[PDB]
Amino acid sequence: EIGASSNTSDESMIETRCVLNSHSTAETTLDSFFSRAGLVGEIDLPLEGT
Amino acid sequence: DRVADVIESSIGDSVSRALTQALPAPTGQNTQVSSHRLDTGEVPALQAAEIGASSNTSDESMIETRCVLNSHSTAETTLDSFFSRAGLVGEIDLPLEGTTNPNGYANWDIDITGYAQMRRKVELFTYMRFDAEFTFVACTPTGQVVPQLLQYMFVPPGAPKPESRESLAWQTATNPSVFVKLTDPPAQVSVPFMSPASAYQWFYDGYPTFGEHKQEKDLEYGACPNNMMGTFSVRNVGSSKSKYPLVVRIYMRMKHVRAWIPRPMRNQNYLFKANPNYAGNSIKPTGTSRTAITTL
Amino acid sequence: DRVADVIESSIGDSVSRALTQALPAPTGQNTQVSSHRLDTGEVPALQAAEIGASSNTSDESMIETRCVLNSHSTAETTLDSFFSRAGLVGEIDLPLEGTTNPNGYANWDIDITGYAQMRRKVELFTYMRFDAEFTFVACTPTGQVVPQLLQYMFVPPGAPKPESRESLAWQTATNPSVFVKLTDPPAQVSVPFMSPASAYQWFYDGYPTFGEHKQEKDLEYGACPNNMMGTFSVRNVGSSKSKYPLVVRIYMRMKHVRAWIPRPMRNQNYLFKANPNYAGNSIKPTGTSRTAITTL
Amino acid sequence: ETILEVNNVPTNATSLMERLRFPVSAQAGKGELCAVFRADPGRDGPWQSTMLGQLCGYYTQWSGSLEVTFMFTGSFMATGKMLIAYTPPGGPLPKDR
Amino acid sequence: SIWYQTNYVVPIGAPNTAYIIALAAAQKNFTMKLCKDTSHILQTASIQ
Amino acid sequence: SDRVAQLTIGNSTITTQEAANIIVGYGEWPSYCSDDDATAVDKPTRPDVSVNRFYTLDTKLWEKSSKGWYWKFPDVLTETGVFGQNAQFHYLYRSGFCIHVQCNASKFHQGALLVAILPEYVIGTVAGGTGTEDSHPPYKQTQPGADGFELQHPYVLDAGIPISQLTVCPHQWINLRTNNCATIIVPYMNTLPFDSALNHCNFGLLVVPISPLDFDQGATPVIPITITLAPMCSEFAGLRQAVTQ
Amino acid sequence: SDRVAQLTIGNSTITTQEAANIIVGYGEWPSYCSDDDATAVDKPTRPDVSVNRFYTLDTKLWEKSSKGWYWKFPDVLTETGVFGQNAQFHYLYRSGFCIHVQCNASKFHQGALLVAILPEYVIGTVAGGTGTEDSHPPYKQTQPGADGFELQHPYVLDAGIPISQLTVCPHQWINLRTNNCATIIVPYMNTLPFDSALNHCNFGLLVVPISPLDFDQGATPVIPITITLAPMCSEFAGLRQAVTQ
Amino acid sequence: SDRVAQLTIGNSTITTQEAANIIVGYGEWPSYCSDDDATAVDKPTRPDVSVNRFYTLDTKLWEKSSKGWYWKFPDVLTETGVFGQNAQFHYLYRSGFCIHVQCNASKFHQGALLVAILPEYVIGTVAGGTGTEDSHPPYKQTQPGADGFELQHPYVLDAGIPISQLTVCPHQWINLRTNNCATIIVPYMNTLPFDSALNHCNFGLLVVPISPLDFDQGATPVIPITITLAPMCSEFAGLRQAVTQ
C-alpha cells in the first residue's frame, strides 16, 4: 500500500552463499539502449503516381 | 568449541592444486653437447607407456649430440595464429526464380558447423572463447558485381525474425543492421563473445530439456542453447523484386582466442551440422594403406 | 582461498547455547517490603500463558507485603534426598512344595518396575544415572529367622544362568556372589552405574531390533537393552532339599543421582513391568471429584 | 514492482481488469492449489504485464534474483496462511503441497 | 505454485472470497545484456 | 516486536503476525556432537541446508469433538526429502528441531490447543479394557510417521499419564483469541550421542484441544492445523545401503 | 614405492600391488567452486564422506573379441547411493572423480586396455549405413548409466574420431604383463560452475582393448574388468523434489 | 508512529489514523523556480497561504462495478479559491501538490484502490471501434476539472497503456483491510519553468479499483472516495485580465 517496492534481500529469504557479481550494467544505460540507428521516416519520389 | 574434523575439513577449497606451470617458449629448445654414457642404473630410453605420460627421453641420451642454438620461433603455433584466419562458414542464396529463398530475403541460422574446413579446425578443441570478425562477400552467382542495396541484420534469439522482404522487423530499431551496396567492398564487422556460457561448446554430451527423451526427441541430443546465437537475416532493401540474383558468403575470423580440452581430429566425412554422425558403411582408415608392414 | 560460506558456517559447534544458569538456592527466597503502586503501563498480574512460560508475577506486585527473611532449607528437595531411600523392588520365593521355585534356587530378572511405590518415583523422570545400595532381607514366610545358608549371585547378561541348585555356575569364579546366613543381618552391597548408555531410561519410545515389526513382535516395543542389567540368582547352598521355605526381599537405595527430563506423574494403576498399559474401562480421574464447581 | 497478471485467463474485454488479481477463498480440504506460473520473466505469460518483462524483451540475456510481492486484499477480519513455492529447473509442476 | 497452508478463515458477515495481487520486479543483483528488439509487439497498418 | 516473527532455515521461510514468542526446549539450542561426547569414529555427514529446512508435513482438521493428535519425531521426517534419505542410508542420526505448528481462525472463533514436546513418548494400550490382557500398540500406532495419529484417551495421553501435567514439557498454547501458531525449538535429547532414526523416536509432538473449538454457525467451519518442522544440526554416520525400517 | 598404492575416500579403501602411477587429468586436482566463479546464490550442500567415496559400479568380461566399452559419467552414479540422491533432489551438481579401473590376469596372459577420459563425449550414429539418414543415438546409448555400453565402431569411437588419437586425453593403459589397474583423477570440467547431473555428462570413460587378450587354453578364461569410481568435492544446489531425468 | 498522520498547510489540517506512510513523487519536494532555471523576467506572485492549502474537491461513490476515475491536475483547481484566480489572471503558473485521497469502510468490507500520478496524462479514443476513424477526446474529457472523469477502458487507461505498469509512477494503494487514505506529494514536473494552468495539465491523478469492493449485505453500501489536494510553492507571473480558458 505504501507504494514502495519490497526491499527484502535474498539473504533474508534463504541461506545464501557468497557470490562476487561482476556482471556489467553498462549496456543498460540510456545511451546504450537508445544510441541505435532505427527507421523513423520513409519518402517516395516515384515517376508516375499521386 | 568446534569438532576438529570441521576445522581441518578442507571442504571449500576454491583454488586448484595445479601440478604444472606455463613457462616461456619463444623458440624451440636448443640441443646441448652429449657424450657417450656407459653405465648401469640409468635408462633414459626405457619407459612405461602404461602410466599415460609421453616419453621424456632427450636426444642427448640416445646419441652423442653436438650443440645447436635453436632460434626457430613458436609464434605461429599460438591459438590466435592458428585461428585468426578468415574462413567460409556461411552461404546464403537470394535467387529470382526458385524454391530456396524467393521473395527477396533469407534467414541464416548462425551456425559455423556447416563447412568442413573451418569446422574441423575448431572441433580440435572442446571449448572455445573468442571474438570474431565477420566479413560478408556479396555478388551474383556469376561473380558479377551489381548496383544493388542490401541490409544485413543480426537477430538475437527472442527477437522478431523477419517474415518477408517488407517485414516490420527491418526497422531494426535496436538490432544491429548493416546497409551495403554490392559495389562497396565486402562489409566487415566486429563481434564479441556473446553467450551465457564462458565458452562456446563444440560438443555437448547431453540434452537441453529435462523431459522423457523418447525416440522423436533424440533430435535434441547434443543441442546446446549456449551456442545458438540467433539468426542472421538479409534482404534487398525495397518493396519490389530484386532484379538480380544474389549470393552472400559469410567469412569468420576468430580473434582473442582461448581454447580448452583438445580432442582427436575428425576422422570420417562430415554429414550433418551439430551431430557427429558418420557413414557406417563407408568407414575409411584415418589415412593411407600399404600392402605389407615390411615394405614401403 | 576458501568459499566464505564455509568460513562462517557454524556447522560443528559442539557446545550448547544454554540461555539459563543454575544459581545457589540453599533457602527459600525472602520477601521484601512492598508498597502500593497505582500506575499505568506496568502490569505484573497480566500474563500470556500461550507463550509456554510460568507466571513470573511476584507476591510484592499483588499485595503490599512486609519483609520476611526466609531461611527454610531446600536441601531435602534434592534428587539425592528424594531418592536415596531404600525401597522394595524385588521379591523372590524359595518354597519347599510348590510350582514357583522348587529345586532350591531362583533367577530374578533385575527390573525395578515391579513395585508401584518405587516405580512411580523414578518414572517422574525420563533418564536417570546413579549408583545403588542393594540390601537383601531374607527369612521364612512367617517372618521367622532360620539357620540357613544362601548364595546370591549377580549374573551379568551373557553369563551362564544357573539351571539348578547344583549348577556349575555357582562356582562364581568371576561373577560377584554373596554368602549369607539368614541369621546374619540382611546382606547389603554397593553397585555402580553399569550400562552402555549414559543413563538408565525409564521410557524408550522405539524398538531394539530393526526387523519387520509384525503383530507377534509388538512385545518388544519400549524394550531398551541398556536397562537389562542381567539377572540376580539365589540358591540355598547345598545338594539337598532346603528344609525351610524361604523368601528374599530386595531393597534398593539410589545414590549419586542425576536425573533428566521430568514427565507427568503416573495417573492410572500400573499393570505390567516396562509397559505403560492402563485399564481402558477403569480410567479414573487424576484425583477426587465434587458435585459442583460452586460448592466444596 | 508492477502488477503481475498471474490470472492471465480472462479475455472478454469486459473482464480484462480481472487478470490483475487472482482469488483465494474459504476452502474445505487440505493443501488445495491456488495458482501456478512460470518464473521466467522474458517468456510469454504473466510476466508480460510487468515493466520488467517488458524491458526484458529488449535484451537477449539476463541475470539476477527476482521478487514477487503478493498483497492480500480481503477484509480485515479474514485470516489465513498460504505457502508460496519456487521450484528450480528440472522440477515438474508439483502435484501437491 | 501457491498452496493453502491452512485455510482462508472468516467470521459470519464477511465476504467468503477475496483477491490477491501480485507485484513483481528484479532484485539488486539483476542485470541484462546484448540488447535486441522486443518481439512481443509489432503493429500492422503503417501508422496514419 | 514479539507477535510477529520470521523463521528461516535452508531455502524455507515461515512468517507469522500473531505469534506468542518462541520456546527453546529445556533452554538449550541444538548443537553438534562434542568430540568427547561421541564414540562412533567415522567422520559424519552434515548435509546442512539440504536437510536442515522446513518440511510442512501435514494438515489436520480441528473439530468441535477432536480429541487431539501426536506425531513421533525422528520418524515423521523419514521418506521425505534429503533428510529422509540420509536417515535410511545411515545407521546413526542426530539432530534438533524447530517445530512450528500453525492454525488460524477469525476474531469470532474460539478455542485453545496445547502444543507440547514429550521426550521418549512411549505409547500404551487399554489392555483389553479389563486390563487383564497384555496388549501392545502396533508399529502403525507407535511410529505413524507423517499423518500422525489421533489420541483415544487424551486425558491420560494413551499412556496412563495426566495430560494436566504435560506442561512440564517444552510446550506452548494456540489460543485463537490470542495467537495462531506455536514455535518450539528442541535440542537433541537421548542418552546416546547418536541413535537410529528408524527404531528410536527421541520425542513426540502433542497437539491437543483443551478448550474446545466453537463458533456461531455461518463462520467458515473448516479450521485446519498444519505441522511444519525443520531439523537442526543434522549429523549422520554409519553409512551402508538404504534401509526403510 | 610406485607399483603399490592405496586410495582412501569416505569409508572405502582400494588397494593395488601392480599399479602404474596415477594420472591427474589436465594436471589439476578437483576443487570446490570459487566465490567469483559461481552465480547460483543459494548456499550449497557438500555431503562430503557420504558421497565422496568409492562406488564399484560394474564388471565387464574381457574376451578375445571384445570391442570396448564406455560409461558417461555424471550419470553413471545416479540412482546409486547418497550421491545419486543429492543429484536427483538438486538441480545443480558439481564434482571431480577418482576413477580406478581394475583388471588382472596371470603372468601367462597378455593384452592391453586403453583407459581414457574423453570430456563432452558426444555419441554419433552410422547414419543408416549409407549416411543419408539423419539418425540419432537413443537415451539408452547416450546415457547408459552403470552397466555402460559397448562400442560398435571403436576405431572411430562411434563418433567419427580416431581412437588412435584418444591419448591426448587423460588416459592410462592396463598392459597385463605390466600392471592390473588404471587410476585417473578428473577435475570438474564444464563451461559452467554447476550443471545438471541429469541432462549433462561432463565426460565419458573409455576402456578399449587395443592389443587383444590372448592365452593358451587351460588358463582361467574369465578375465573381468571392474569399474570403481569416487566423486570428489561434490557440491549441490537448487533443492526441490527428487527428479529422475 | 506511522499509521497516524497530520497534514497542515495554510488554514487546513487533514487527519488520519490508518495511513500508509507518504510518497514523495520521484523523491523530490516541491521547490520554487531557480534564478537560472527561469526566463520570465517579471517578478512573480507567491500568494503562499491563500493558495497553498487543502481544497477538498469532490466525492465519488465506489461500487462493486466501478471502473475507476481520473482528474487532470493543474486544471482541477481553477475556478476554485484564490488559487483559481491567480491561475486565470496570470499567464504563467508553477506549483507542486500534496494529494490526499481518502476512502474508509469497516473491518468487514474489502477492496483495493490504486492511486497514482501519471505525468503528461494524454487521453486517447477508441478510434470509432474499428480504429479507422481518427477521433479525438473532447475538452470535456481531457480537462474535466473537479468532478473528474470516469475511465471507460481502465485496462489501457483509455490511452493504450497497461495499467498493470502504472506503478512506475508515484502511487500508493488504498487497501481497506490495511488503510483508508493515500498521500502523494508531487513536485512541479514540466520541461519549462512555468506554463499555463489553463491549456496544460502537468499530470493526472488516477484512482482505480484493482481488487473490487465487496461486502455482505446489511453493511453500509455507500463507500465514498474523496479527493483533497493542496498546491505547494505556487508561483505566478504574466499578469493580465482574468482568462477562463
Ligand SMILES: Cc1cc(CCCCCCCOc2ccc(C3=NCCO3)cc2)on1
Ligand atoms: C552486423 C551483423 C553481425 C552479424 C552476425 C554476428 C554473428 C556472431 C556469431 C557468433 C558465433 O559464435 C558461434 C559459436 C558456436 C557455433 C556452433 N554452431 C554449432 C554448435 O556450435 C556457431 C557460432 O550480422 N549482422
Ligand SMILES: Cc1cc(CCCCCCCOc2ccc(C3=NCCO3)cc2)on1
Ligand atoms: C552381589 C550382588 C549384587 C546384586 C544385584 C546388583 C543389581 C544392580 C542393578 C542395577 C539396576 O539398574 C536398573 C536400571 C533400570 C531398570 C529398569 N527396569 C525396567 C526398565 O528399566 C532396572 C534396574 O546381586 N548380587
